[PDB]
Amino acid sequence: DELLGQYLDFHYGPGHFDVPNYPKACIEQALAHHTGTTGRALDLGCAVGRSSFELARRFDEVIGIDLSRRFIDSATRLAEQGQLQYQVTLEGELIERRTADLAALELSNTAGRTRFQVGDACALDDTLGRFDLIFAGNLIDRLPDPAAFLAQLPALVRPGGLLMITSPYTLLPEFTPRERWIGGFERNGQPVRMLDGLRHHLEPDFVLLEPTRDIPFVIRETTRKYQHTVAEASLWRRA
């Protein structure tokens, strides 16, 4: 509930600190680099759906997957009704009701091209098929088995397609057991960055489109308290 309002403002609310909407900024970058066909896209960790609705402006079908049923139900309500209402925290128990509106964002006309479903990004259904584009925003550093997640990706992207991963690389044992980290540590006195881990698992099936890019984002917790974070976006062409 509390996180739901934070995420609905994150995906559909006004900007904070003059930072552009993050889901939209991410998909703008994906679409500026996708040179393949526009039949099918996959949004992993789609949360309440802004990136999926943005992808649906260009792709014939967009599948959004998240572990949270509450998030998936909200994205589906937006797709079907065009709007929803939610609460955000002002101060303590003082709250304020808000509206998310696809029509105001020019997203309603293509909302019917989305389908949202509950799923586990580390163990996706074997019926999912392949995609022209896969977006995984703010996901990798929240998964319990990043290697299992990455092992699926060569098979899920058609040759010539695009994979986009964004992450602030916030490594925490509460989300990923240390033995499973793909980066963020030293090995033989050499630093192994998360990006090095991504390259190890994804190359040569994917080719990194250099350079990576910083994309900032702001999450609102109260009227006064925010997270302001700089994610690294890495774009990968399927060879």
Q: Tell me the CATH number at 17.
A: 3.40.50.150
Three-state SS annotation for 93-134: CEEEEEEEECHHHCCCCCHHHEEEEECCCCCCCCCCCCEEEE
User: What is the DSSP code (8-state) at residue 168?
Assistant: -
Determination approach: X-ray
Is 111 known as a binding-site position?
Answer: no
Residues whose CB is less than 8 angstroms from the CB of residue 1 and which lie 6 or more positions away in sequence, other chains included = 70
Which phi-psi region, left, alpha or beta, contains residue 129 (left: φ > 0; alpha: ψ -120 to 50)? left
Distance CA 10, CA 220 (A): 7
Amino acid at 190: Q
Based on the structure, what is the number of domains in the chain? 1
User: What is the DSSP code (8-state) at residue 17?
Assistant: T
> Residue 12 corresponds to which tokens in the numbers above?
């559909």
Residues whose CB is less than 8 angstroms from the CB of residue 236 and which lie 6 or more positions away in sequence, other chains included = 162, 163, 164, 165, 202, 206, 207, 208, 209
Is 120 known as a binding-site position?
Answer: yes
**Angle (nearest 5°) at CA 128 between 127 and 131:** 145
| CB of 84 closer than 8 Å to CB of 60 | no
Amino acid at 236: W
User: What is the DSSP code (8-state) at residue 91?
Assistant: E
Distance CA 89, CA 87 (A): 7
Q: Residue written as tokens 């060879």?
A: 239
Domain of 49, in residue numbers: 2-238
Is 32 known as a binding-site position?
Answer: no
Amino acid at 138: N
Residue 137's CB is within 10 A of a number of other CB atoms, namely: 25
Specify the 3-state DSSP secondary structure of 38: coil
